[PDB]
Every structure is written in C-alpha cells, then in structure tokens.
Write a protein that binds this ligand. Structure first.
Ligand SMILES: O=C(O)/C=C/C(=O)O
Ligand SMILES: O=C(O)/C=C/C(=O)O
Ligand SMILES: O=C(O)/C=C/C(=O)O
Ligand SMILES: O=C(O)/C=C/C(=O)O
Ligand SMILES: [Cl-]
Ligand SMILES: [Cl-]
Ligand SMILES: [Cl-]
Ligand SMILES: [Cl-]
Ligand SMILES: [Cl-]
Ligand SMILES: [Cl-]
Ligand SMILES: [Cl-]
Ligand SMILES: [Cl-]
Ligand SMILES: [Mg+2]
Ligand SMILES: [Mg+2]
Ligand SMILES: [Mg+2]
Ligand SMILES: [Mg+2]
Lengths: 401, 401, 401, 401
C-alpha cells in the first residue's frame, strides 16, 4: 500500500544526555529511523512528534514533502524551534523508509553522491574529556592533557579539531559557558580572565596539534558582539580554521565578522532558508553550519542550495549518536558546497551496541556507506538495555554546578 | 521564605480545544496562576513547562526576570515558539504570585494602571458560531445569520467585530483556512471564489453592523503577498478597521501594507523585541498584535515600549478562557500605546464554572478589576469536572474535514 | 488614599556643584526621594519639576506611568533635555514612594533582582583629584600623582578606573575640555600636544594600575570624528576597557567605531528608546551608557530591554551623590545586560552627613541593599547645614578659568 | 565699548498664557529685545536664560555666534528643547542690539531683504475663537460660527487660514487635543467620531472660505501614523493647502507623507540642522516649519539654507505677540525658499499697548518694516500694567478641563 502504519519514538541513555529516535513502519514492513535530541535546549520534541505522527498514519511513505507542507500548516503559528525539530525528525525517518523501499542509500534521494569520502573535524576536543570525563576518557584536567589530546588527534590522522572556552587558572579546570547559564552571568561579559585562559588553552592545543592540524574555536552564545570582538582581537595572531559564534543578531554578527582576522562560522541553531537569509544578506558568515537533524535533510538541501548561490559552504551539525553521523554523511555526500563535516571521535563505551553499523574513518575522512537508507539502524534490544535518565544536556551541566 | 515550592500544569476541556494552566505555589501558601494554549499550532508547551519548572523550585518567587534570564540561557538554541510559550506561561504564573504576595493587582507591577476600562472588539464574530456551532450558538449557517450576528453585536453595544474568511456559495457554509491546511492547498492561491465570498460575507456583516460598528478582517496566514494584494484591491471600497495578515516575510508584508488602503495589523505569532524588529524596521504594520500569553506579560511590556518608540499601538491577542482575558486586561491597563483589546464574547456553557470571576463588560468596554493578582483564579474541582480531550485547535478542524 | 500630597525640591552644596532632590509625600505619610542634577549642562530642571509636580498632587502615587504619559503630552513640543530630566526626577521619586508603600526595595518593582553585587569602576580617576582638589584629595598635580592614584585603586581592590584628557607638559597640570568650552576652541581640533599628553597620562596610569586593573578613557564631546580617529590610532597599542565618545552624529560615531581597535561606549546624554535607536541602527556602540537619573529608572528599563535585543550591554551613568548611587544600584540589580556600574570613589568630606545610608563596596563590587525604596534617604537637617552655591558644574570650570 | 552690560527677562499676561521677553543692554545704551514662550510645553526657559546671560555680560554685543558656540559647549549634554530655546531667545536679543548699533533693520544682518511683503495665513482660525473665547471674539460655538469665521477671513482679504481638530456633535463644541492630554487618551487613536467631525468642520470652513481661500489643517501630535493615514484617506477629496503633522519618527512621518494626497508640513518643534536632517533624508515633508523664536534667527538661516539644498521651502512658526511677528518678518524678508508666513490675526484687547509698533497687513500680506532692529519694542510700563499669571499654554487647557 506504501502507507505509513506507525510512528513511534524511542529513548536511551547517552550518559549525560539521552538519545532519541523516530521509528516509522510501512505497510510493506520497512522501518525508517531517525535520531533527534532534546538536551540541547529542546524540551518538547517528543511531544511534537507524537502529535504530528498521528496525522501521518495512513498517508504515503513516499510523500515526505506533502507531509512537511501539511505539518508546517498545522503548526504555522509556533514554527521554528522544538516544533520544527519534531517535523525534521519525522522527515528524516520518512527519507530512510523511502530509500529502503527503493533499495538505495539516502544520498540517492538527494541528487546522488558526488564524493565517496568526507573530511571531518574531531569535535568537542578536548571539550568532552574535560566536561564529561565519566563518559569520555582519558579525563583532561590540565594544560598538559589539552596538549596530549591534540597530539592524539594528530597521531590518529585527524586534520582538524574543535575546542570551546575553558578556565585553567582559577581552581579545577572548568568550562566557561555563561550563554548556557554556567556560570549564571547573563550579561556574558568577557574579562581578562577569559582572554588569558583562551590564550593558554589554545597555545597548549597548538603545541600538541603541531603546525598542520587545524584548530577550530567554538564560542557558542557565550558573549555579546563587544566580547566577541575582544576575543578575536586578543587571538588575532592565532592560526584558527574558524571561530564559531552563535547569534540572533545578523547585524551584530556581521559587525563582528567585518572586524575578524579569522573565518567566522555560525547558524547551527537556525531553521529554514527564512532564518538563514538575514545572515547571508548581512555578509555575517564565512561558513554556515546546517543542523540537518533539526531541519530534516530535505529541508537542509534547500538551505545548502541557498548558501551555494551566495558562494557559502556549509557544514553539518553532528555531535550525537552514530545514526546522526550516518544521516549527516548522506547529506555531505550530496552537497557540492561542503566545507567540512563535524563528528565526535570520543564515543560512549556502549555506543556500538546501540547501532547495527558504526561509521568508518580512514586518514581523517569519513567513508560514505552504500547500504539502503541512512547506513545504520538503532537496535531495539540494545536501546532497552540502556534506559534513559531524566533530561540532561544543557540541564545537567547546571545540576553538576 | 518567598521560595517557589511547586510548579504544576493542569488541563481541561474547552470543547474543540483544551485550556491549560500553570499553578505555582510559594512557601507562604500563595498560588499564582497562568493560562496557556497548545491547540494553536503549539504541541509540547506542557513538556517545556514541566522541565523548566523543576529549576524554579527553591528559587525566589519575586525574581521573575532572573528566572527568565536563566531559562533563556538553558533553551537558547531552540528559543522561540513552544519553548518561549512555556517560559511565558511560567512568567505569567510568577507575576500572579508576586502580585498576590504584595497584595496588589498585577497592573501594579507593570507601571500602575493608566486607564480603568478598555474598549474591546468581539472577536471570532461570526467565526465561532460558524466553525464551532456545537459549542457556541446560535449556529450561523448562511448570510442571514452573518447579518444577525453583527446586529447582535450592535445591540449589545460592542463597537467592533472581527471575522475571518468564509465560503458561502459552494455547498454548506465553511471556513477558508488553507494556511492551516483546511483545505490542503499549500500554495495558498486566492481565486475568484475567495474574493466573491469575502465580498458577500462582509456586505452581510456590514448590513447587520450598521454604519457605526467597526469591522476587522483577519486573513491569518491564508495567502501569499500576491493574494493578500488581490484581496485588498478587491475590498478597496470597504470600510475596514484593519486587515490582519500574518507573515514571516517582513519585506513581503511591508510591500502589501504599502499598497493597502486599509490599516494592516500583524505580529500575533511573534516573540520578543528581536522578532518584532524586522517588521517595524520595514514599516510593515499599522498595528502590532502582541501575544502576552505566549511571551509573558513582562516580556510584552518590553515589546510595547519598543512599539511605542516607533509610534505603533499594540493590541493583545486574547481568544482563550477568562484567565487569559484577565491577564491581558492587566497588560491593557498599563500600556499607553494601546490600540484596542480582543476578546471572545461567545463563551462555552461551562466557562464561568472554571473560574472564580468572570470579566465584566459595559458599553463595549472591559472593566479592569482591582483584586490581587490577575483578577480570576481557575477552580481545581471544576477543572477536574471537565476532563480534557486529545489536542484539538488546529488539529481538530482537520479531523472535522 | 494613596494620593500624592506634595512634591518639593531641595538643594545643597556639593563643593563645585550642587546636589538637588525631589521629595514627594503621600497621604499615608510615605516620603519618596530622588536626586537630580543641574550642573551638567542642565539649567532649568528645578523649574520643570516645580511646574509638573503641581499636576501630580491629588493623583495616585501608584500610577507612575500614567504621570509619565501625561507629562510627556504636556511637554511634547520641547521634550528631551531639561524637560525630560525633570520628568525623570519625578519618576524616580514616585518609584521610591511606591516601593516604600509596598515595603520592598525598588528592584522589586523592576523585575526582581538577578544579582546581589555589581562590579564597578572608579570613575573620574584621577580626574576629580586633578580638577577639584579643594574637595577631593590628595591633590594630583603631576604624572607621579596620576600613577599613585591608579596604585591606590589597585590596592583598594577596584578592578577598573576611568580617566579623561589631561595636559601635563604645558604649565600646571590641567584638563583638556574644549567640548565644554575650557579652553574655548570650538572646532575641537586634536593636535600633537593632545596626543602626546594622552599617551604620557595613560602610561603613568598603567604603570600604577598594573596589568590587571582595567583602564577606561572618556573623551566626552572633546573632538570631532576626525580627531577621535586620530586619538584612537595614536592609542592603538594601549589596552583600554573602552573609549567613551559622546556624539550627536550616529553616522559619525559609527564611522569612528568601525575604525576603532578599542570598545566604544556612548549615549550617556540621550533620552528614551527614540534617541538611542539611530545609534544602535548604525552599529555605533559596543556599550550604551544609560543615565537613569535623567531618564527615570522605569524609562531606563525600556532602554535596557531595547539594548538587550541588539545584544548591547548597558552601564548606568553615576557620578553624583549617594542617592544616585542607590538609584542606579537598583537598576543594576535588575538589568540582565549590565556591562558594569560607574561610581565615584572620591567623596566629599560631608557626603555621609547628607544621607541615612552609604553605599557599601567589597572586593571591587557594590553590595545591593535590601531596604524599602532606593536604599538611602537624604537628611533634611543636613541638607540645610550645607546651603547651595550658585550653579557650578560646567559653569564653574569656566569661572576657574 | 560694545560690551553687553545686562541681560534681563520680563513677563506679562497674554490671557491664557504669558508673553516673555529678553532685554539686553549695551555699554552704548542700546537695548536689544526678543520674545520667547514657556507655555508651549517649555517650562524652564527663563531659568536657562538667567544662567546663560551671566556669561554674556562683559562680552561683545557684536559676537553673537561666539556666544552661541560657547553656550552650546556649556549646555552640550542637555542641548535641544528648553536649553536651546533659552539660547535662541538670547541670540534674538543680540541680533536686535547688533542691528540697532549699526542702525539697520535686522534683515540687513541676514543677507539683505529680497522681498518687501510676505503672504500670510491667518492661523488658529477658528481655533482661538473656539478655545479662548474670553480673549478672542466673537466666540465660535457651532458650525455656523466656523463658516462665518472663514467668511470673515475671505472678506478681510486673507488668502489662507489654518484650523485644528474640533468635535461638534458630542456636547458643546470642543477641541480634540489628546497629544497634549485633552482628553487624556495617550494611545492617540482616531475613531469615527474624530473623522466625521473633521469632515463637518472642514465642510463648514470651506462653505465660508469660498473656493479661492486656502485651508490648512494642523493635526499637531494628535495621532500615531496609523491614525494620520486614516485622517488623510478620509479627507482625500478635500482641497487642503497642507496637512501639518508633528512627529518624532522620521520613518513614520515619511510613510504617512508617501501615502498622502495632500502636501505635508512638519518640524515646528525641531532644533538645528541636526534635528531636521533625518526628516529631510527620509523625504518626510513637503514644507518645513522653522521656529526661529525657539532656534534663534541666525541658527534658522542655517536651517533655511539646508532646506534650500533639498528644494524644501520653509515657513516660520509665528503665533505669539507682535515682537515675534516682527522677528519672523525679518527672517521671511531674507529667506529665498519661503513657503508662507504664519500669523495670528485674532489679537488680545491689550496687544497694541505692549509694543511700540504693530504689524501692518495689506491685501493678505505682511509689510516688512524698515526700522532699526526687529521693528517693534516691548513697552516696559505696559508690561508692568499686565502682570503675568501662573504658566498657562498647554497647562491651562488641562485646568479648563
Ligand atoms: O556543542 C558545543 O560546542 C558546546 C556545548 C555547550 O557548551 O553546552
Ligand atoms: O484565530 C483566528 O483568527 C483564526 C483561526 C483559525 O482559522 O484557525
Ligand atoms: O564627567 C566626565 O567624564 C567629564 C566631565 C567634564 O569634563 O566636565
Ligand atoms: O498651535 C496649534 O496649532 C495647536 C495648539 C494646541 O492644540 O494646543
Ligand atoms: Cl537529554
Ligand atoms: Cl552578568
Ligand atoms: Cl487543544
Ligand atoms: Cl495548492
Ligand atoms: Cl550645579
Ligand atoms: Cl577652535
Ligand atoms: Cl504661559
Ligand atoms: Cl488611550
Ligand atoms: Mg557550534
Ligand atoms: Mg489574528
Ligand atoms: Mg562619559
Ligand atoms: Mg503646527
């Protein structure tokens, strides 16, 4: 019949956060999967999906843009954010199911592949070993460990690494994340302490990385334009692949970029061409980060095309489980204007239990798989062996505090 | 202690949709309430509130902007929409509790009152009698009933009424709501049928209203700029108080307004100064609709001040239960630049059972109450006597179809 | 009755200028106070207050935004400047009275507090010891005294200091203030003499401050854009917390900022969102100075919210008596987007006689008090023991000349 | 010596407001005069003048731009409004004294005259006979009196008349002045009642004026852009010389003008090229009103030149005593780009007692005099025979209410 018979959500432990999944089944017995997240400031996504999936039952699994169009209509007033994440999660499950029904990898729905491998950067490096050492080891607790982590990246043939903001000289090593309320300093002022610690951290990372490995710096939402300018001027003499700055002020981000000696990336939290547009019109970015897990991969192809017309390359936002990596792999396979792909190389001890297939890296690149659908399936029995905790993510840093 | 002890949500039947409430209790035994909605495209608000309220327990009930600032940080990546609605619902409960603790009406927290009564328009008139006749009577099923409803508004001393788009000459009277997927025609084209039915409907309404009662026309998201221009040109010779058009294109809405012989209102679905700004910068509106139930009343005071600087008057979005009306009443009491206040005069048969106090109207104006807090409390026993159904609102029109 | 019974003004000696106060009494016997200034280019404020306060008698003390709205109407043609200062002074007295009536600190009217302490900078350092040595000692008369003053700031645990422009190598140490007619050189040209003396002064200050204490430079209105650029280029290699430039040309200030290696602050002389707007639209500032003594604290909350939407942090303008400090303390307690708070640490020998309570500093921060109202009351008997002189401020530098 | 020996202010009764004067005496015994106003929203001007005139004593009477430059410096922070009115009043007294010293009319200081007579409009017609009937008769209390007043204007050979907003069909004839708080309706909404009364009033005026006399409509600050558009659309079919709209939103006024079938005038409350600039840049006006009594005539020549470069004609703001008329006459004599000159033809019973010379009109034009100075002197004995009342103007309408 090609009809969708069911849309369900599943959830499992990922240590300091949960993983979430959409499971969609068709009349033919094909199962399409996606992975989504609630911990990155996104409570409610499951509820959105539960409501919207009810309308999908009985509809064609082939008609994903029909479903998008209908869902957009039905949630038009509160579009964006958690609503749009729910829609994107369902879209990604539909795509998997459609590809499987046609016996092709998902990239065959996206224009075909135009590359077989994708260069990555090792993300949250050493951020995960500092911030979640119970889950990702070896723990990093000082500048020497920062250096050693970059050395490890170099030895393992990764070509780039991304770090965040850390305070080394004021007690135990800790993250500076005021944009996410740790500490609670909502003006997000940047002082000498921040600047000297950024310098110390990046000098140690560079010492370990050597001169060839690229260093990316993510500042997230942790400053105002004033403070971002102060950081960029302080770090004017560093060799940075990019400086990543999230902002809801296209004019403010553009001002910062105009005064930056480094490439600027942004946009990981934005939805649709509509939200990216003011930033591109303002010349706000060198690189656009596209969260295809949030937007849905089909919507993300639209965003990538829009970026392409502005001669802006895009990078997928990818810092979740293996299924997200494979989802993003298919996007990266198909998009001409691809800057690079993010991935976390630090993995949970039980990561590989949760999925049928693990991503394969060789010489700093991700190998794009050629199996029907995204390239990996969550394993239901394994999900149930790792029951979820309460919401973590941005909420559990604040508990740890 | 002034500490928040608990944050709970409650839900009850409102016929074709549910009402939702936040109940916040302090160490002193004061209860603060707000009302929120999920049916207007907003699945997930309860989940957001459930997560965010956990951080609030143990904090001061007096420190509402502290809570806002923290909540904004913790949900920064997925801000807007359902996330921001959850934050606004909690804010409105905090304000009620704070006002009650200080033994003052909520307007005493908002600058004091500057008016004792507020002119209203009778909203969803005759929209509710056409679309939800099981709940709001007498049913309207033809042009004569449209006329009689406007006559009723005139007799009852209401000074203004707002209608939507209706098709009269193609079978049983029915709403034209393609922007919300009834019918599913996602291009939102406007054809002759739409235009001739708009004319027929508005002529009947004017016939009943007489020459003094004002007529507002809400087009919601039911067209593209092309179609909005076609409607405005068709209706160029009508006397309309305003034409309401929701748009996520500030440049497109500005173009439409620039070519409109009628005042244009918009913005009911927007959050924060940040989202209103591009519309004001573009000269997109005569009147800004502010949903204080969504934004929170404190955030809405910021939006009203911003509008004031642009010499734009604001109107509260108010089409829910009595508590929402009283919340909006307090906002309307305090804001200098107030255009008018929306209210639904068609009420559910059990509406007054659900709340301690009902809004009082005299000569087309709402009387602003002077009780501590918002002016009415939901009644827990009554809530439980009217158990909720599954989500309705935008989802149940589509079931009816 | 909650009625205002009287509005009076009081004035006392502050050495080289006077302090002024509004005293407002309610039917319940509550007294609300504010402090205002005439010496900073503002003759006439008392007269404005005397006229406007007459309309306030008999009105509710609770209805401050009503009074603002009415006063704005009654003075609409000549709004801004001295008129708006009079309105702001009355507003601040109303707020004190309202808070006292409700038995809460003023920050409880402003959203609640979100911080308990506020970092300050020591303003007019060493400006007051150079320019008014009869009142603030030890006198500073050379570069060594400049250095020692910065050392003192460091020892006393202040984290930042702000200086102005001084000429050291052309006779006795003297201020360069052509924007305020000392000397009378109304083109405000910047020559080599200015630049070399700025360098000499700042080098001495840095020598004393050490590397951790931040140095702010206030240039007031003492140049044209051409000259501001010359100063910024000369000082490109200094570590400056900000460079403060007052301008009535948003396009000119924006040009200067665009070419500045230092953060730029401005706006201390502006009134309302309306006046700040062209500067924010032009990307003219890193930091917005808000004079809440001038604007009124309620109006200033509107300005702070507007700034917040542009991701601009604000700093209160605070260089008067203890009551102004406490007024600003309450604003600083409540505003999320707070850059820093100005305060003068050099005090008059009789300062503490004039007020019931003095501000308390610890480790470079101001402690926010928790008494009803602003936190300090002027003492009538003490005011009368220090009778005012003729207007000083900007007028008495010109006498000294 | 050419030194200024004294600067004094004088004040006398003008019925519902006071007239104010600056009297400046030189070492040679020459007396220079100006007239200023406090009642049009401007409490404090006398205090400004009292302070600033102290610096002028001992300076050259010839050096008026020196004094301006110095005064601007000394009041830079609170410039505009009442401060700038005080400066302008002194400037106008300096000009009179300088012209008298050189034995020439003031226009000889302003480029020489380029016309001998100036067409006027009869302002506040029938506004003064409606609003201040105790002082200006015959009283106007109905539409017939409105018609008769326009007939009188026609018979007396005036070519144009200006009215304001009046309500005829809701009790005794009364002014609609919500922008000045009568009534207190600070949203400034425009409803049907306003529109139908505007129509009725203007139809009666046109009936009396006949087809040749021009009708100007002044809306002051009595609406928001939304409401101004509603008025202009309602009155689209009237023949109006201009519609006058005061606004502090150059973008809002520009929007209104862009949609106006009538010429738009504005700017009467603005100071300096700096304040006019955003309006001219925005294409906000057909005609710029320049208040030379406020700005000073020398500053106003700068404003007129600026307007000239934009091909905008200017009109003086002139609705005070005979000295203001003569001040404006000299400006009008000299400015090429002169639209028309305002004047009040309704005079107080004692007007001519207060001044040495009265303005002379012939065939709808003002004859420019050729006496040294402005053309008339206030008479000290007469001033003292008409002692002032408390401040009236905008404050006394509110008493009458
Ligand atoms: O994903 C990041 O780059 C940072 C996350 C955080 O600070 O929570
Ligand atoms: O609230 C309205 O105006 C329309 C709602 C709808 O068509 O669903
Ligand atoms: O307050 C200041 O920064 C400077 C004042 C002055 O030079 O008069
Ligand atoms: O001068 C006018 O045109 C109006 C003045 C007023 O309404 O007070
Ligand atoms: Cl989580
Ligand atoms: Cl902070
Ligand atoms: Cl619902
Ligand atoms: Cl369609
Ligand atoms: Cl002073
Ligand atoms: Cl000079
Ligand atoms: Cl007066
Ligand atoms: Cl109003
Ligand atoms: Mg990032
Ligand atoms: Mg609407
Ligand atoms: Mg300053
Ligand atoms: Mg006028």
């Amino acid at each position: 019949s090609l009809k969708v018979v069911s849309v369900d959500t599943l959830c499992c432990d990922a240590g300091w956060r949960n993983y979430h999944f959409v499971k969609l089944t068709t009349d033919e017995g094909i199962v399409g999967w996606s992975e989504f997240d609630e911990g990155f400031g996104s409570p409610g996504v499951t509820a959105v999906i539960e409501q919207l999936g009810k309308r999908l039952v009985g509809a064609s699994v082939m008609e994903h843009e029909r479903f998008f169009a209908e869902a957009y209509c039905l949630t038009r007033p509160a579009t964006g954010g958690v609503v749009s994440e729910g829609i994107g999660a369902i879209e990604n499950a539909l795509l998997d199911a459609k590809a499987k029904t046609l016996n092709v990898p998902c990239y065959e729905l996206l224009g075909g592949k135009l590359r077989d491998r994708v260069p990555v950067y090792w993300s949250h490096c050493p951020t995960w070993r500092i911030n979640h050492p119970k889950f990702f080891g070896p723990p990093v607790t000082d500048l020497d460990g920062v250096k050693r982590t970059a050395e490890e990246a170099r030895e393992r043939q990764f070509r780039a690494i991304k770090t965040n903001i850390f305070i080394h000289d004021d007690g135990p090593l800790h993250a500076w994340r005021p944009g996410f309320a740790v500490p609670f300093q909502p003006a997000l002022n940047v002082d000498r302490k921040v600047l000297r610690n950024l310098r110390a951290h990046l000098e140690a990372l560079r010492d370990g990385a050597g001169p060839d490995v690229e260093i990316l710096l993510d500042l997230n939402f942790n400053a105002k334009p004033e403070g971002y300018l102060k950081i960029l001027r302080e770090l004017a003499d560093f060799d940075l692949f990019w400086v990543e700055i999230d902002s809801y002020s296209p004019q403010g981000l553009a001002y910062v970029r105009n005064h930056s000696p480094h490439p600027i990336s942004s946009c990981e939290t934005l939805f649709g061409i509509r939200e990216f547009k003011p930033f591109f019109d303002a010349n706000a970015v060198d690189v656009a980060i596209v969260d295809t897990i949030w937007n849905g991969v089909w919507q993300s192809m639209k965003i990538a095309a829009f970026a392409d017309a502005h001669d802006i390359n895009v990078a997928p936002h990818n810092f979740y489980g293996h299924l997200c990596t494979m989802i993003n792999a298919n996007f990266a396979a198909a998009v001409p204007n691809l800057r690079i792909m993010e991935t976390d190389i630090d993995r949970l001890a039980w990561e590989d239990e949760l999925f049928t297939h693990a991503p394969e890296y060789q010489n700093g690149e991700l190998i794009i798989p050629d199996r029907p659908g995204w390239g990996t399936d969550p394993v239901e029995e394994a999900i149930l062996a790792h029951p979820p905790k309460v919401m973590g993510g941005l909420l559990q840093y604040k508990r740890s505090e």
